[PDB]
């Protein structure tokens, strides 16, 4: 649905957008912290930072535990850059105590210096899908993730990853809602992932973004997805 932002929700949101101790912790979970600085990046058309994104991705993961939802494992936003610049060896230990082959969906948020995109591995559909709210193609990211799956299977499960039936693609500009400002890339990334982890068609547009920013502030403060 697009549940309404209530009066008290507004009162609470406007409240944390205010001036205050920039480092003050406003929400805590997953042994992570979200400060007033972090919340501000959701304000106006500010650029989302890694703390907001990773935190949200972790909420998606929490939600994914319920019946009728695909299970999810979300890498943090430093993962892909580190895999790309150094190799598998530099990230292999990031998944001791997680079996990536035992969930339905891997979320890979991707930071490109000044922009955010999302890669998703879906083991049900057997494909590695890249999503850019500015319509860029990044099949090299997908390839890198395939190669990652091969190596992670050898290292954690001592068998070769079955490559048969896998598709690596980038969503085309006209298949997913695009951004139209210079700021909302983080928001598209998060909301793309929200729909995907609910198994529902992407049903929003740039028009919903100021609503989504304000709402996200709230969902983060109360550590509940609406």
């Amino acid at each position: 649905e697009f549940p309404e932002i209530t009066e008290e929700m507004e009162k609470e949101i406007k409240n944390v957008f205010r001036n205050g101790n920039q480092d003050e912790v406003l929400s805590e979970a997953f042994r992570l912290t979200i400060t007033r600085k972090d919340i501000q990046t959701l304000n106006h058309l500010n650029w989302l930072n890694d703390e907001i994104i990773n935190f949200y991705m972790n909420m998606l993961m929490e939600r994914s535990k319920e019946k009728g939802l695909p299970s999810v494992h979300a890498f943090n936003t430093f993962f892909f850059t580190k895999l790309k610049t150094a190799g598998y060896q530099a990230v292999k230990r990031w998944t001791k105590k997680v079996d990536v082959f035992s969930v339905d969906i891997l979320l890979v948020p991707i930071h490109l210096g000044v922009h955010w995109c999302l890669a998703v591995v879906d083991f049900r559909k057997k494909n590695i899908t890249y999503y850019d709210s500015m319509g860029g193609i990044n099949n090299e990211a997908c390839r890198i993730l395939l190669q990652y799956l091969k190596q992670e299977s050898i290292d954690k499960k001592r068998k070769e990853f079955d490559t048969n039936g896998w598709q690596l693609f980038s969503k085309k500009s006209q298949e997913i809602p695009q951004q139209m400002n210079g700021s909302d890339a983080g928001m598209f990334a998060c909301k793309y992932a929200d729909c995907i982890t609910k198994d529902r068609p992407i049903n929003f547009t740039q028009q919903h973004m100021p609503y989504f920013r304000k709402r996200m502030v709230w969902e983060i403060l109360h550590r509940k997805l609406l």
Binding site: T33, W94, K96, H111, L112, N181, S183, A185
Partner: protein, 83 residues
């Protein structure tokens, strides 16, 4: 006391610490950044991928002699350009 760690910046530079196994890593982080001349909130301390909270301890994280703490900076983004 019980272990020596390497805190390695993403520019490849190292600062060595000797730390107690049951002590919170908050002071370690605040030392590092203070030493670097940067504010705390600009930095992110990972141990093999796991974000290190102010109340995390070496024991909790299963760290061993000579283990590595990686420092990452904040990532921000909004759009892509021309190239």
């Amino acid at each position: 006391e019980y272990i020596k760690l390497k805190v390695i910046g993403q520019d490849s530079s190292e600062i060595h610490f000797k730390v107690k196994m049951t002590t919170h890593l908050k002071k370690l982080k605040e030392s590092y950044c203070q030493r670097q001349g940067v504010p705390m909130n600009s930095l992110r301390f990972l141990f093999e991928g796991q974000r290190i909270a102010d109340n995390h301890t070496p024991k909790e994280l299963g760290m061993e002699e000579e283990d590595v703490i990686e420092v990452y900076q904040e990532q921000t983004g909004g759009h892509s350009t021309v190239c």
